[model samples]
Target: ANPYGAYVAAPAGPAADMQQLFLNAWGQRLAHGRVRWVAALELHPAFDFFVGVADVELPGGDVPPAGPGEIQATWRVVNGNLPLALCPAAFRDARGLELGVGRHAMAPATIAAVRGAFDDRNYPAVFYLLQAAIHGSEHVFCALARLVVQCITSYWNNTRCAAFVNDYSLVSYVVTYLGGDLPEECMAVYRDLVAHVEALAQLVDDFTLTGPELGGQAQAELNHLMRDPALLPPLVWDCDALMRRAALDRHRDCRVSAGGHDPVYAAACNVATADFNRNDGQLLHNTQARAADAADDRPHRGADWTVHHKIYYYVMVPAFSRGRCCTAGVRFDRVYATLQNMVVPEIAPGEECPSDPVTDPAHPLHPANLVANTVNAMFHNGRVVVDGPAMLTLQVLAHNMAERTTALLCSAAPDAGANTANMRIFDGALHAGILLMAPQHLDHTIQNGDYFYPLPVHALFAGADHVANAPNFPPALRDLSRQVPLVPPALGANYFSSIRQPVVQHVRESAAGENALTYALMAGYFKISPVALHHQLKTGLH
Candidate 1:
């Protein structure tokens, strides 16, 4: 007899019981019947459908159990409704199926593994593996939904928790199936499933918050009654009402407390109501009163403050003073007085929400218009441009790759090698966009154009002769290429060279034989032309 028991024996506590309960619940929901258990054991392609059903069961039945069969068949029969009822029923009926042949054969091995691990105090490992299994199973389901069927129309119609089971199962399936000692052909489905699941998970997570914010039963009712146009008006009214009330409260206090309210005592309260209606009113009224008192030559030492003064002194000045000190106090006060009287009357009531410079359309520097104007100016003037060398090189490389690939695909190639070379180059261009450049710069390029290398490479490539004659390319590219010298120049060269080498090698390997058929196939796959490659290579030198 072994000193340590065959099993670790589940820890004697509610924690273990709770974990077991969760596992049992998941198992019941996911593998309720003999067919499901068998499918899970065999790693069926449609196993995720069951897991999705299980997820749906967690927060009330939104997804129904897809019966044992091809997933499509089950999906067609169930439509898109949650299969809550089927799960419990399946769990209850699953016992007889467990006694079936497949379960009998697999059960003993699974039980033995669990018991042995338990005896050896491998409960943690067992729990981890189980969790992984569950996650993997969920990922597989999402993969099936995305890849096999490509049914993403209603992919994220539910919450993250609801979608996570399928995603987890799909991921697990891929990791296990690919990682397993299975044949390539056998793993193909899992690989496809994994890719699809990842894509679907991304899609599901990418859903924006739109439509009504209601959830649960209310959401269900809204969906049911969506056809009634009258219902929508009330909902819109409710939203408007909420917005107005919020705006009113925001500005009311600010409007009431404008002018000099004693800095030492009311300094804290001065800007606190900036968002409120009273804040604006106070600012305007105080500014007018100050102007009036000044004109009358009254002792308005503490008369109402000008809006410009108030904003500059209380808001802008303080914020700006944090880093640097400059006196704009007197000028700011005068500007505040003039602008307040001139503009305050034009401001519409309830314009507190609209007065925000960041979001308001009326604001001179509204973010949307600012961004648009900046882009427009850069494109039109070509004065504002990114000034970086490495970035410029990358941009040139990408353009060359795309143009070369296009040309190559349109040209004749004698062998697959040439075609693959172009394809690899095209792929290299895409990969370069992601990996060759710093992510921060790349992200900036995507969001705001290449701030460091803003010139359009396509124009240069298109007018190569013109570009060659132009005196700016060398200096411009040089300025842009700020290759950090932390490492040797050879290191940077090697890094870029290494990145490019793989494509060339893959092409060379594919081109072993001068077979037209192979070349054509490769060309077809990558969609590149020899003519494009010739042009690209020629232009790339500059």
Candidate 2:
């Protein structure tokens, strides 16, 4: 057995039992019988689908189980709207599908090699082979749609999680599929990696893809990745200098290979144009059918599409609501005051929930548990309304502790650039906003749908002039206000100042992406932060 076991759960616990129960219920609904267990991906050491599958009759033939077939069974279970407590944690997230499409499509020996690399803890080797497999897999991009849909419906939606899967997959896919793997020298430099995934990400986004050549789902998934530079990994900052040099070298190889200009653009255009021009009768018929299906596959268009549906619903919307915004703003006031005036101990990690909750029911309620339970219960969805001034005192301390989180990140990499410093501040502000915003309300609309309340445009950027007029608004930031329509084209020249005079409907839409920028920055902050953040409840609050 490998040390990581499976990156997903085995079929033993309540989550497992629920998975089987739902799978059985779903199996009965299928028109075909003789559904018996065939090959199980979960049986593999490195991957787990968390549900059993059996082959079924299809129009094509008696096909054995694969990820797509398993997805249909799982989708039935998800759409059944069963309580999440009963849902398998695997089904609650899209990582299974993300891993499935990438791994299943790889050669069997290639995958076995990957599993061995993990067991050996040869991480770079694992990354290299996985990159090779992802690039080589013909099935890679088609699975992107399935992954995106799963992200929205599942209760535990993480934009970065999905983006990371695709970004890495795309880096391998693009480098091999378009430009071919980095030349020996580029790879030698890129032997070091982080934003190599992101630089590759931006390179693909530079050209647009549309129509039947790329599936709608693939397009939807890429939109999420390309929407904000902040959504790119924090590692992008870690090796910005290296990747820039490497990218230029890679592009030079592109010129040599493609006979001039950029190879990425030429290859993309050739494939798309070939598909467009070579439509014989049958090929043309198929193209129309594929295009029609793409039209039908349109999924939810979010009010804040730039922000991951999960973040917009869970973090941004609530953080910007009137009550939550007030609380967040006020807490920042207190936190800033405390940081300048006093010393806080280096933040301590919180007590972890017992690993064996079944055997330690009392453990969760013990005085040892008491602080944790109270700390947890304060933000309990049921206890949305915070206490009066008494509650305010304790919460402000929470903000003070929150402010110290930056010290952890800052002290660890004190030499990081100014951009990273700005990220830390924005990241702190966003978290404090979400923490205080916990008192606000939620329901199916905000939780499951595209609904969101708008944030003041100025609220997103405290000093609008500084961001707009400053000499250092990096090219990485150009995407911040791009697609989101915060103001009319007529006022485009003065949109920044106009919103300041008063922000509104247009500004709200703009705030969606602007806030997305902050969400991205916050996401990167946690990924790179040196210390773990925790919560505590003192006697003063009770």
Candidate 3:
């Protein structure tokens, strides 16, 4: 039915469960002001639980389909007898609860409109709508989270495949994974599109995922989108000032009309349409335009446009691990609930499995697949009531989305622009750091919990790529996360975790947010190891 139908998989009518879950998530806003979004957002660790990813999953590590007993044993071996410090069989009670509490919930028809733009290859409309959806609340950060979710959960299927980084948008994804999946010669593009579905993806999340890397998954996914000249879509950089201005004009009508209009709470309705255009939609032209020319693509003099600076801070919550911290994620509660047509029961100790192997929430062996009988039977009894979905689902979705990265490498003609844009989505916070970090120090001391330590200094602007390998990275901003299960193992505990000098433990821990880790203590690189860990010819810090 679309231009890409002949090469890639055809779209199914709202096929992926994530899409339906997404549909229902929005059903609240559009149907009526019924749902309470992120009402008290908490953690969702279903991905690690489902895939059974530990702090470390070596080649011959504790593989999946692992029994509960085997999983506990592995935890003891790695974490050294903590209260399992891992996701429990009981976690499903929390993980499976559908997320319907989004504060800015909108109607599915609004989102359906996003998909239609992609189907028609509508960039002007597609571009602004994409940015408008996550229009700040920190787009680079919040939108990055949505990017991770959509790319991870709905890599390809119904509506979003073409617009986001998938086989249709980046054919290389297909050629990389399946091989011979596309034409022999290099073409005008990688897939039909690349990172084309960024805005559409903000709405996709089924929260069903599993993978071995924690935030590292984001880094790996970015690898596909990068390769010099960049793998981003050329059209993404094609829009001039007029296009986005018009695009936002249309968005104004859509947003106001999406809901039935409630003046009582109209103050919160804002849009990130224009700013998003600056960062993604429009790039300055090669021809030198005078500062006097309105077309001159320049920032406000020396406005903060990069992350070469900006202190990094990390929060440490030992057993409180989940895919939450300084990152964003999606919720699958509604979808999971819809999966069983009722609240899916957790697999009680001796009680037979609640749902069958295919759709069971708490892992298989449950003999029956309960249906229709809805009641909040899961809130009590060794169970924690969790309505949030795991961010790992998006991690996996991002991973799956890049399945064809290598294929793009083989393409005779590749669209590096799309790949480049795609990379920003994968790099997540780090990239966000580059795009959105404040101009000055974080007005406060580093807080505790999962976070970016030091709150600044990733890779010194000294020619090294990302911070981890940057030869100039201060010991403070260098990577230093302790691995764990449920959440990506990388802990940003900093002077609080294992990598920093214990000499400042008392100095670092005694207090409130930001004051937890002073900027001075973080920059003292001399206390840690002197040289970077060398891997043959390579060299860098944590």
Candidate 4:
């Protein structure tokens, strides 16, 4: 017969209720064990399921006699429930038992000191269970104990104050220990907790989230941690590099500076100026002969020849400026003068010049006819003289090309196929589109600087001479009037309407405003007719 048979058969009473409660508690404990078993098994294949089964079954099975007789058997049956209470009690008692053993095995004084400091009211066993459940590691007991003490002290003073203290301490612990190893079981509970702590820290650092109040110490710690390179780790380093590259690429295409400075714009300007000068100077020389030939046939050539002379000089300078020889109003002559000023002093005063107009056929400096012929020869032969503009242009172009090439090379250097393709497309598109646009934009700048072409504008009016109205004018010139700079309050509103308003509104209203100005300036400088240029501008080049 089973030892628990009598208890199972016993009539319902307070004793039976108590027995059932203990039974239920045991069931819950079994459930926890099962969960732990499953979790452990999930992590590795070598764990044995049957290792603890004998111990479990021994307690679960029917009890036998403890002594050698029927009397002993009867007494044993009466006390069969004794072992049931021992299960939970054993875990609770182990700490004291282990502490004693630890003292005997190691240092008695240290053990005594620990016991003296320990508070029975703190429920250290319960704390250990909860901490292990939350933190995944039992190694944090010292830290957890300190926090628990602070929490309890703060709680005794005021519940709200206690809550703040507890929250702050918990968050600090979570953030400080992110990616740290914990007791294996605690990972499930702590994953979301860690995320929350990180989010709070981000809020504090970015000023996007706030707490009720933060202490100066906490703020200082947070600020210091924000700049801490250790906190960023390798993952953050990789992400930051990728983000910076992406931002740079975006800015490169649209001329919008992603970071504080307009490095992209400055780079594009340098590239554009370089390309412009190289092409412009060569083209000007090639075409200058044609201009000179045209000048020779003109009526003014037979007289003082100043008109023909001025035309030849001024036209080529403008062409050279428009092409790429100089930027910011610096011209070929300015470049030549700068170089001449640098080197001219080096020539010895007593030494005769190598080429003289009277003797040498290849005279280098024959101011009138010979100099003109030599320049014409250079133009016809498509040769550019070594001068400041040529050298500056070459240097700028070389630098721009090198930078762009390096960017492309780096982009293509990735080991992954997808990354390589993505980088290649990004680098290719930016270099092709923006770099191409640079030359054209530079040319426009040069032409505008030389010619002083006025851009079109617009004016606004309302019905009659009310608060918004102005005098009526021809519709073709109506837009031009609007672009005239207005005074004070009207200027602010008009500037907004003209410059900041949508392109659709400008088109619909026939406002020869910002968009029109853009078109007119582009057309005049590019030497394209306004109508075609407007069409291209509106419809886009493609």
Position 106, candidate 2: lDDT: 26
| TM-score of each candidate structure, all chains considered together | 0.15, 0.19, 0.19, 0.15
Worst 10 residues of 2 by lDDT: 404-413
Rank the models by lDDT, top first.
2, 4, 3, 1
Candidates ranked, most accurate by TM-score first: 2, 3, 1, 4
What does candidate 4's lDDT look like per residue over 427-531, in tens digits? Answer: 100111000001112232212222111111111111111101221222332332232221111011111111111211222232222212222211121112232
Q: State the lDDT of candidate 2 residue by residue for 168-223, as single tens digits.
A: 22323323332232233232221222222233223223322343312212332322
CA lDDT, candidate 1, residue 318: 17
Q: Model 1 over residues 66-133: C-alpha lDDT tens digits?
A: 34322211110000111212223233123223322221121232222212321221011111211211
Alpha carbon lDDT at 143, candidate 3: 22
Q: Model 2, stretches more than 4 Å misplaced?
A: 1-327, 330-361, 365-373, 379-504, 507-542
Candidate 2 residue 156 C-alpha distance from true site, Å: 3.4
How many clashing residue pairs appear in each of the predictions shown? 57, 1, 67, 15
* Cα error of candidate 2 at position 314, Å: 16
User: Which ranges in model 1 have alpha carbons more than 4 Å from their true place?
Assistant: 1-349, 352-450, 453-472, 475-489, 492-542
Q: Which residue runs does candidate 3 get wrong by more than 4 Å?
A: 1-326, 330-486, 489-508, 512-516, 524-542
C-alpha lDDT of residue 429 in model 3:
15
Instruction: List CA RMSD, all candidates.
Output: 33.6, 29.0, 27.5, 42.3
